[PDB]
């Protein structure tokens, strides 16, 4: 039903047309710590606990 | 005579048509005459038999 047939005298019959689409993304940022004191570094039994 | 022609093709290409599938051929001319002596001119009106 739908293909393009042209005739002996044609003009104007079968235009199309064309479309684009974007695609996207994003960053975020992340990040943790931890805390000590000097007495836990240096009164542990263990060296090197860094 | 100026005769002028477009075969189809290339040429006949427009935004109308397209395709170019069609063509065209004319002829065009001028033409006038002057009268100097009118009364050398004759001329009889009669009926015609069948």
């Keep these: 039903s739908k293909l393009p047939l042209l005739t002996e005298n044609g003009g104007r019959v079968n235009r199309v047309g064309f479309t684009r689409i974007a695609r996207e993304g994003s960053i975020h940022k992340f990040g943790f710590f931890y805390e000590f004191t000097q007495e836990s570094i240096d009164f542990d039994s263990d060296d090197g606990l860094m | ?50």
Excluded: C, H, Q
């Design chain 2, 1 to 50: 005579f100026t005769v002028m022609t477009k075969m189809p093709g290339k040429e006949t290409a427009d935004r109308n048509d397209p395709y170019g599938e069609t063509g065209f051929s004319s002829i065009k001319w001028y033409y006038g005459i002057l009268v100097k002596r009118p009364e050398r001119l004759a001329l009889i009106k009669t009926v015609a038999p069948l």
